[model samples]
Target chain A: AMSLLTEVETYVLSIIPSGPLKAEIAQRLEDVFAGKNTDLEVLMEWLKTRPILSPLTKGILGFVFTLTVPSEGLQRRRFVQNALNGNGDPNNMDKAVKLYRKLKREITFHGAKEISLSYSAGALASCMGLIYNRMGAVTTEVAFGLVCATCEQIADSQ
Target chain B: NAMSLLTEVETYVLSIIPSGPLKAEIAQRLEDVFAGKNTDLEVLMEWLKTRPILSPLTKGILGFVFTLTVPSERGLQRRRFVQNALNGNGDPNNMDKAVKLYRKLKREITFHGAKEISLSYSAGALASCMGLIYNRMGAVTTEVAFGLVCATCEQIADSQH
Candidate 1:
């Protein structure tokens, strides 16, 4: 069976801008797991304090917004890398910009991202198809394939 | 979920196909199932035990195959609707093959109808803008607009698959 972290990682890779700072974010997550200075609770609290996201066309963007934020979700690369390497303080100007920029991008494409809608659609379609694909070509089996593909796309990316 | 009795019954039928002595028993069992008898298992096995023959996995294949095939009866119309939406049926002279397949499948399956509903309503909306595109009058406009969005997402999804 796939581990929870693996499942979440697979899901996160499905989105874009390649998470910009994924390496750092991943390392930080690892550190937290390793009983370092940070913990998931601290991260969760930090996320809860952030601003609310704007509405999306289909409400799908909210998922992206929720998953990409630093301190709570995946952090940006350069800053996380610098911090992980102990090369510099993670409190620099560029670090702040990366976080803000990542958040902004996630917010910008909330409802419009193809990954969100496609996965949702495909999953729904396949579920329907599973009930009747043997009946004929008209069955939703094909659509299930289409929807499942979208889900796999998002999952593999993370 | 897998019905072993169905498997056994299927094998018995095929195994006794060429035996003249078993025709009455075999055909009657088939007739019952075809007639929608949901509890013909014991009867089928009883007929098979007295027969002098062996069967193959063909019945198992048929058993599994029909699990999905039987549902087509319920999905034919809906599947056609979806197939047409996926590819337009406006050109009577050249209906899309997918649509044609759906139409053909409608007669032979029960689940196709349900499948049509799932794809047209959900999958199409997300990946092909199929939902908005098929809504008359606005079809020309929404189809192109939504089609583009769906196509891009499809490309990405396909690559992943």
Candidate 2:
């Protein structure tokens, strides 16, 4: 099923490459899309060159491993992985949104729940950045904007 | 406030006491001495510092609870253990385990001691309270100091009785 590109995702995929790192980023994106290797560790190692994504990666990976249960978590990670690759499944998005709602409602840090949303956004934004980096400047700004937008949609939804 | 108690409190409090209900009772009493506001850390440290390194009887009980050799050592070690655990000097997982064990034990004791008398021991409650502080401060200190006070209370109880 087809899913829409988030503004930040669109901007990332639309970036005109003009650097020596361009080929490597493109290769990484292609390898990811081919589904030759969907390992998070591989994806993380590829993203590790840019230090700014550190917190975002940590937040995402930590949540995927620690927060959600196996079946649901598997689907959530899949949805994010696909979304980052620009071929998101609507079914997966639906599941992802539903799970996010449940997760956002259930978790808390220091007696407050909203901060958890920020954490989720960090993870989501990094996943998007991984995709955008291939096409990817305004990288940090775009990532921040994505995080804000993702958090907003999450808050706005039922 | 009671400086005289400092001088009067003996190194071991009692000599040649057997390990049984009396020790448990003393531990409970010591917990009381440490609980509440205005607890003097200096005096508490002094009380702990003067005490013997290891209480054979108490070490056995603690070892059973911790499932590790409860290291037999002087008051300095006890004080340091509390300091390190609370200050995030040692492994955080171990600290978490200690706090969890304290809670479980306290709950069981309180339930069992309900009809008989006040459990009198506040070690578990204090550990939990310190746990909250540890969570709040992240890498900070007071909670650790307070936790040790509870630890000393239990140690005193176990060693003496």
- Per-prediction DockQ: 0.02, 0.02
Give a tens-digit lDDT track for model 1, residues B84-110: 333222221122222232232223332
Off by more than 4 A, model 1 = A1-9, A12-120, A123-149, A152-158, B1-17, B20-24, B33-99, B105-161
lDDT of each: 0.30, 0.33
How far off is residue B11 in model 1, in Å? 18
Candidate 2 TM-score over all chains jointly? 0.24
TM-score, chain A, per candidate? 0.27, 0.29
| Residues forming the 10-long window of minimal summed lDDT in candidate 1 chain B | B131-140
Q: Cα RMSD to native, each candidate?
A: 20.6, 17.5
lDDT for B84 in candidate 2 is: 23
User: Tens digit of lDDT per residue, candidate 2, span A1-158?
Assistant: 21112332232333323465545545554444344535554454445444333333333332322121222211123223322322222232222223233333332222222332454443444334232222111223333344434444443442
Model 2 segments more than 4 A misplaced: A1-8, A11-34, A50-158, B1-161
Say what the interface RMSD of candidate 2 is. Answer: 20.4
